[PDB]
Amino acid sequence: SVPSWPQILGRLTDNRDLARGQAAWAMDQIMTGNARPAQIAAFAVAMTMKAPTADEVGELAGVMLSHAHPLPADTVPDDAVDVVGTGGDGVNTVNLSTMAAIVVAAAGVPVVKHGNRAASSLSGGADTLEALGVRIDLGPDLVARSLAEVGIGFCFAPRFHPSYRHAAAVRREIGVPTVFNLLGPLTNPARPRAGLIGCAFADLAEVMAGVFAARRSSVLVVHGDDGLDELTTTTTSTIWRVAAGSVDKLTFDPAGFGFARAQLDQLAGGDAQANAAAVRAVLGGARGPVRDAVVLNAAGAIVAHAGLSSAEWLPAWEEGLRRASAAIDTGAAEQLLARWVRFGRQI
Amino acid sequence: SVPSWPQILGRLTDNRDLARGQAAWAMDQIMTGNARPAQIAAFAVAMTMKAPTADEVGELAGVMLSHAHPLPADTVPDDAVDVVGTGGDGVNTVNLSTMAAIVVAAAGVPVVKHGNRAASSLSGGADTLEALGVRIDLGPDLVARSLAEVGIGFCFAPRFHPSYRHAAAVRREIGVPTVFNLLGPLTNPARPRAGLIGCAFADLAEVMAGVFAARRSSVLVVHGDDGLDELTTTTTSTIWRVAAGSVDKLTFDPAGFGFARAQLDQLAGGDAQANAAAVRAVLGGARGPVRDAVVLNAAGAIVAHAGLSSAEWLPAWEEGLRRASAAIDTGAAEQLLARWVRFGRQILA
Ligand SMILES: O=P(O)(O)OC[C@H]1O[C@H](OP(=O)(O)OP(=O)(O)O)[C@H](O)[C@@H]1O
Numbered sequence: 001s002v003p004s005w006p007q008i009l010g011r012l013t014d015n016r017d018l019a020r021g022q023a024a025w026a027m028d029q030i031m032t033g034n035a036r037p038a039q040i041a042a043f044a045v046a047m048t049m050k051a052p053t054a055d056e057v058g059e060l061a062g063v064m065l066s067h068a069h070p071l072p073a074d075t076v077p078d079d080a081v082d083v084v085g086t087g088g089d090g091v092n093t094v095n096l097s098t099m100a101a102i103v104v105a106a107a108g109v110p111v112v113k114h115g116n117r118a119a120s121s122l123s124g125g126a127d128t129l130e131a132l133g134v135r136i137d138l139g140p141d142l143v144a145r146s147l148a149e150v151g152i153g154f155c156f157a158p159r160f161h162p163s164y165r166h167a168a169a170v171r172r173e174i175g176v177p178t179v180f181n182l183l184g185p186l187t188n189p190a191r192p193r194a195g196l197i198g199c200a201f202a203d204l205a206e207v208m209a210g211v212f213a214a215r216r217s218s219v220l221v222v223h224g225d226d227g228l229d230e231l232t233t234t235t236t237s238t239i240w241r242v243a244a245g246s247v248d249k250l251t252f253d254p255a256g257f258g259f260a261r262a263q264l265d266q267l268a269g270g271d272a273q274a275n276a277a278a279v280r281a282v283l284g285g286a287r288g289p290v291r292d293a294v295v296l297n298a299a300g301a302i303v304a305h306a307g308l309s310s311a312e313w314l315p316a317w318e319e320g321l322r323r324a325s326a327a328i329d330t331g332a333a334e335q336l337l338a339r340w341v342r343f344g345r346q347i
Numbered sequence: 348s349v350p351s352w353p354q355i356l357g358r359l360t361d362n363r364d365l366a367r368g369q370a371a372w373a374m375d376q377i378m379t380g381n382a383r384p385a386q387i388a389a390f391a392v393a394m395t396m397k398a399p400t401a402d403e404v405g406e407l408a409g410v411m412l413s414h415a416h417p418l419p420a421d422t423v424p425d426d427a428v429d430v431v432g433t434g435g436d437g438v439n440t441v442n443l444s445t446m447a448a449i450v451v452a453a454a455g456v457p458v459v460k461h462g463n464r465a466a467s468s469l470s471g472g473a474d475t476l477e478a479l480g481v482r483i484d485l486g487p488d489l490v491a492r493s494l495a496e497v498g499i500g501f502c503f504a505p506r507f508h509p510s511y512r513h514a515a516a517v518r519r520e521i522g523v524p525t526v527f528n529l530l531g532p533l534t535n536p537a538r539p540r541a542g543l544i545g546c547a548f549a550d551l552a553e554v555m556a557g558v559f560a561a562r563r564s565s566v567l568v569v570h571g572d573d574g575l576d577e578l579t580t581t582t583t584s585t586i587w588r589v590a591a592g593s594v595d596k597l598t599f600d601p602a603g604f605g606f607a608r609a610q611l612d613q614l615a616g617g618d619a620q621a622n623a624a625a626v627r628a629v630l631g632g633a634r635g636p637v638r639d640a641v642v643l644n645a646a647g648a649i650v651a652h653a654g655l656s657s658a659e660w661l662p663a664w665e666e667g668l669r670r671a672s673a674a675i676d677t678g679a680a681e682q683l684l685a686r687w688v689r690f691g692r693q694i695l696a
């Protein structure tokens with residue numbers, strides 16, 4: 001009837017789902033600086049061990065978005081796409097989402113990407129972008145301009161979600177992954193309706209998918225069956241395909257499209273300078289396992305985009321793979337990155 | 348190794364028992380002021396939802412005890428007993444543990460009682476003792492003197508465990524019961540080897556028993572089947588009997604000894620002043636439900652004390668009840684409270 005920490009924490013430690021509105025109450029306390037770090041941590045942990053539901057995580061993400069800096073009215077195309085994951089997969093890979101995102105934009109799909117620096121890897125998508133000379137410090141107006149002028153824009157989470165600072169501090173202090181690790185990908189401030197969304201935690205991917213389902217997004221939530229928060233080339237992947245308010249879970253195998261099985265070590269990354277070099281290599285046309293993984297993920301995002309103004313599954317994949325490879329082979333992706341760097345320098 | 352929060356918290360969220368030493372490392376961070384409040388709360392919650400083991404809780408309590416103020420050497424009798432519970436049973440009662448402790452002491456069993464103010468109740472043992480004029484603020488030397496000159500001493504937890512203050516603050520901030528609620532009963536700084544220990548939560552009583560078993564204490568861990576963290580008179584109780592380093596679970600029925608079934612409402616308490624009046628009535632010999640409950644719990648403690656030197660179960664109880672009754676009816680219990688109060692008043696001058 002009246003919410004409070006003991007009531008909500010007690011319900012969670014009792015292994016019970018929250019009543020409607022309780023998760024939202026907790027999140028709003030956290031976003032307004034009213035929650036003690038101890039209360040934030042207890043909530044994050046207790047929700048994780050109970051097993052959060054889509055409705056609960058929908059409340060968390062929705063409260064968080066309510067405090068975000070939005071983009072200006074009518075600056076995001078109806079069919080814009082995001083490509084991003086939770087991170088936290090524990091494998092030091094090159095920046096597959098960030099590379100796929102450039103390829104997708106170069107293929108002519110508008111991209112508004114959310115992301116952040118590394119949390120447990122050597123270089124995150126934002127670190128790599130920065131090393132490439134792309135501006136990761138742009139606010140709402142300049143991101144809208146990047147999107148209009150370059151066909152791609154990057155929303156740096158800390159710049160768009162300043163009120164999340166209390167929760168983010170607690171995440172860093174406790175270290176262990178929680179339900180909070182789901183929130184970045186769920187809270188793109190430009191609110192695109194399509195996306196390729198990676199989840200490192202197989203048990204929570206269905207929940208992320210359920211959240212997108214209630215937004216009527218066209219999304220592929222993906223988890224490599226080797227643990228990657230990306231579509232993998234080393235084995236199969238699980239995909240939770242979200243459209244028209246529902247979810248269609250399936251096992252995806254890239255060998256069906258003629259991809260050779262790679263080993264994880266072939267996808268290995270390093271620091272920002274190293275991963276930036278790996279981007280240039282791929283966009284320059286270097287063949288091999290890294291390109292293969294980039295093309296696979298880029299095609300996945302194109303399939304998500306196709307889901308908006310809606311091709312069937314297989315033909316969409318065939319076309320996504322054609323467009324992704326062509327965006328690299330024709331130099332369009334290399335050219336678009338150069339254009340993105342110039343845009344940032346002309347500010 | 349090497350231990351860290353991500354490692355230990357990750358193991359707990361994966362629903363795994365900790366490795367040997369991890370709980371102790373976490374408690375060391377907590378007790379030295381090196382744990383952030385977020386880390387303390389994450390640990391408390393994660394350990395609770397995983398379900399703590401007796402080994403894990405034993406590590407927490409042992410580290411905690413290593414930072415406590417000890418009583419001076421050779422001041423605690425070999426056969427000293429505690430009577431105390433977790434609290435948090437959410438039933439408004441008179442202070443049954445504190446009353447029983449006075450009666451037990453007056454029966455000639457040395458009592459070194461650990462306790463604290465109310466957390467959720469209207470008056471805790473410490474609050475009620477304060478209302479009776481008993482000094483709750485004494486350090487190790489004076490508690491030892493109290494035990495010698497009066498036959499009972501009270502260890503006020505915040506006085507003896509100052510390094511637990513960061514953990515205590517987090518407990519209050521989150522409000523929800525955790526594994527940390529088990530620590531008061533497990534960390535009596537006088538380390539008596541026998542006790543009557545109340546549990547508000549049946550699911551964790553076995554863990555509490557296990558920690559006492561590892562110490563080879565003689566203890567009855569108790570939970571009333573009506574929810575009380577005391578031996579109840581309204582219905583049966585569950586007892587985990589700790590003896591000879593092992594635990595066994597029992598259902599206990601006070602009707603077997605001639606106790607009438609009381610109603611929970613008959614044991615209702617009030618503020619410290621009211622609960623102090625209830626202590627006085629019982630020690631003056633008033634008959635009824637409150638006396639019955641005190642006598643039962645006092646006998647329980649005397650049974651635990653007896654277990655320090657092998658007495659069958661039923662005779663032990665018979666003698667326990669008789670001893671508790673006599674301590675009241677001879678005037679000894681009322682006289683002991685008076686001596687205790689007098690002792691505290693002697694401290695000035
Ligand atoms: O350090 P970690 O916790 O494992 O996270 C690695 C990266 O994954 C996420 O973004 P994104 O998917 O955009 O990065 P990517 O290009 O490396 O896939 C996250 O924002 C990090 O930047």
Ligand SMILES: O=P(O)(O)OC[C@H]1O[C@H](OP(=O)(O)OP(=O)(O)O)[C@H](O)[C@@H]1O
Pocket residue numbers: 430431432433434435436437441442443444445446461462463464465466467468469470471472473531545
């Ligand atoms: O407010 P609560 O969280 O419910 O706890 C009630 C009381 O019970 C415990 O002590 P003890 O068993 O010594 O007190 P008692 O005499 O009241 O039984 C605790 O130290 C509190 O003083």
Ligand SMILES: Nc1cc(F)ccc1C(=O)O
Pocket residue numbers: 116157158159161162163164165166168169184
């Ligand atoms: N304020 C933030 C918002 C995010 F989405 C992620 C991190 C932070 C931060 O303050 O570190």
Ligand SMILES: Nc1cc(F)ccc1C(=O)O
Pocket residue numbers: 084085086087114115116119157181183184185
């Ligand atoms: N993992 C993330 C993904 C995003 F898109 C934005 C922020 C984060 C983060 O975890 O801080």
Ligand SMILES: Nc1cc(F)ccc1C(=O)O
Pocket residue numbers: 463504505506508509510511512513515516
């Ligand atoms: N310091 C303490 C020790 C205890 F055992 C219980 C509570 C406190 C406190 O600081 O409140």
Ligand SMILES: Nc1cc(F)ccc1C(=O)O
Pocket residue numbers: 431432433434461462463504528530531532
């Ligand atoms: N419940 C307790 C029992 C004790 F003996 C000491 C401290 C407490 C407490 O919960 O602070």
Ligand SMILES: [Mg+2]
Pocket residue numbers: 084085086087096097098198229230
């Ligand atoms: Mg990624």
Ligand SMILES: [Mg+2]
Pocket residue numbers: 085087089093096097198228229230
């Ligand atoms: Mg990744």
Ligand SMILES: [Mg+2]
Pocket residue numbers: 431432434443444445545576577
């Ligand atoms: Mg008690």
Ligand SMILES: [Mg+2]
Pocket residue numbers: 432434436440443444545575576577
């Ligand atoms: Mg009680």
